[PDB]
Amino acid sequence: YAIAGNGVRVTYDADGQTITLYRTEGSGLIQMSKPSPLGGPVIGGQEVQDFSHISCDVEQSTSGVMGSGQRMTITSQSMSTGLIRTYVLETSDIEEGVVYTATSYEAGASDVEVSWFIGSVYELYGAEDRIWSYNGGGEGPMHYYDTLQKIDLTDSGKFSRENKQDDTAASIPVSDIYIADGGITVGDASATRREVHTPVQETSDSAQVSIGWPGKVIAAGSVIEIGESFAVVHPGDYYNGLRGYKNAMDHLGVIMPAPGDIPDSSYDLRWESWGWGFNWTIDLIIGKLDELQAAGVKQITLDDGWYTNAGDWALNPEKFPNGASDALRLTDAIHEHGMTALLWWRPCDGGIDSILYQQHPEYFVMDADGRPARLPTPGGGTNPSLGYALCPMADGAIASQVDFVNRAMNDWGFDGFKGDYVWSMPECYNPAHNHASPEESTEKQSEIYRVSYEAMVANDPNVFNLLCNCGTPQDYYSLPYMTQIATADPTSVDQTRRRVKAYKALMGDYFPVTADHNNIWYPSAVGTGSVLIEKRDLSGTAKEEYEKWLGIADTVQLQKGRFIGDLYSYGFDPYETYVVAADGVMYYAFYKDGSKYSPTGYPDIELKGLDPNKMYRIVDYVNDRVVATNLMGDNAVFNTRFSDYLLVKAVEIS
Ligand SMILES: [Cl-]
Ligand SMILES: [Co+2]
Ligand SMILES: [Mn+2]
Ligand SMILES: [Zn+2]
């Protein structure tokens, strides 16, 4: 029993009751998964093991979620539970590598209490010494836990992570595992946020990636759909899998902004007002504008500390003694220097001591004990800076966000927003809100992002919008409403660079991504094709360094180039490598300073994706030196010694 789509084959063995995934390679196939069991329900702490094969029906010409392709419907039965499982896999004639899966269960004569449903599981075939993984979970740890994780198969430990999305986790419902021959992505096939896990788990000699959803009581005689997923078989690294997921999710209407509609000002070099921490003043910021302008900065963020309280989002009198005219004199000065002005905020936060909470507690999320619910940190808990959550279904909550947007743009002259320092959305138990379920607040969190952005756009179609779910992968359902993504308080060059590739994969190769400014890593910012940003008040050689790198970034402008993620595989090619095509020229960036993946010694550099019949001069554009005089495209291999990074362009020679 088998179905095929573009670049994928799926086979079902009725005896073992297993699925095997293959991808196409040349005229053949590569097995990507070991024969893997169908996902089942968890009852009384145990996955049900007694399912038997009833039927597998293959339809060769059918139309599904992804349009025309194929379908395989597997029916299974459990005598102990009375459950009949219907497991549907669909492939697409067009969508490369993608398998859509949907599961329903029918109960027999009696109710079945399921704590959890495992949707699909795939154990990687052909692993050797390590597997690399993309982990989209929002459960934290914040900041210092890498999104990209190496699963070492030679050590003592056993990697295991749930990758949650729930009332304390709002990130990306996707996981990928890959080796040299490629990988398997699994992601939630839902147009809207829901509770889901995408676990990554080391096995005896490999790893498995899976997806699962919360259980429910299945009433006797009832049929219930329990969850739907996309899987992507792919060559190469997580970029290819995540790109497959992006392509799949288009069919559910989760469509990321098209390149042609992204504003010019969302590609601009930016400085953010953290030169003095919370002790910035309007005049300190204005005092920097001449030098920032001369060095090539085109955008300024007024960062945290400008407001009285979250929710209210009124000007702090200490920062704005003359009120709105002070905000205007700031944004006017920014505009006069040829720059756009951005404003910091924390969407979803209605404050604690805010007038908003005092006058309108009914706008807020209410916990099960009848108390106002704090916004959660990843994995649970809160933070002293985080106020009470606005309920995204409360009209007054939404209006407070819209009113803020309209004031900041139309009264204060801001051109966009830096949303920051917020994660998931607590469950709401306020009876007056009449929620379908307590999870509805969590599910509807992104309504805040959508409505806010729609208001922003109505004022200015070129408005800038960014949201930082700091130290975690960004809330996936926020992404359609953004004009730029930050890697989100990366704590290492490894984090910022690898996340640039992940965000490019999910958002599009021209989607603006910044490598952020938590640490100074200008080469990482330029070479990944990211927007170089900064926040410090620099002097002396550090100032010169910033000016140098602004000049490079402003010359090559790789932030506006086409990111190319499918030529090199992170953790398998000799160097951590990034590629951007800008104005017809291939730019490459090789790094050794990322401790998570760095070669022994000085491997040869191979430039891929050049024309085989052409000859190229390889130029280090940072240092303006020729590192290789003349390479043919089909053998573009050279050796150069560098300590941390090498940024080169391949210049065609005639
Ligand atoms: Cl990372
Ligand atoms: Co942040
Ligand atoms: Mn291990
Ligand atoms: Zn509510």
Swiss-Prot record:
Listed GO MF terms: alpha-galactosidase activity
Catalytic activity: an alpha-D-galactosaminyl-(1->3)-[alpha-L-fucosyl-(1->2)]-beta-D-galactosyl derivative + H2O = D-galactosamine + an alpha-L-fucosyl-(1->2)-beta-D-galactosyl derivative
Keywords: Glycosidase, Hydrolase, Signal
E.C. numbers: 3.2.1.-
Biotechnology: 5 ug/ml of this enzyme pair converts A blood type to O blood type in an hour, and can be removed by centrifugation, showing the pair can be used for production of universal type donor blood.
Catalytic residues (UniProt): 420 (nucleophile), 489
UniProt entry tagged with the keyword Hydrolase: yes
EC class (word): hydrolase
Membrane listed as a keyword: no
Activity versus pH, per record: Optimum pH is 6.5.
Region (Glycoside hydrolase 36 domain) location: 263-527
Function: One of an enzyme pair that work together to convert the A antigen to the H antigen of the O blood type, which together release galactosamine. Catalyzes the second step in the conversion, acts on the product of the first reaction (FpGalNAcDeAc, AC P0DTR4). Is specific for galactosamine containing sugars, does not cleave GalNAc residues.
Further facts: DNA was isolated from a male human fecal sample of AB+ blood type, the sequence was given to UniProtKB by the submitters.
Domain characteristics, as noted in the entry: Has an N-terminal glycoside hydrolase 36 domain with a probable carbohydrate-binding domain in the C-terminus. The C-terminus is not required for activity on soluble substrates but increases efficiency of cleavage in red blood cells.
Family membership: Belongs to the glycosyl hydrolase 36 family.
Protein name from the UniProt record: A type blood alpha-D-galactosamine galactosaminidase
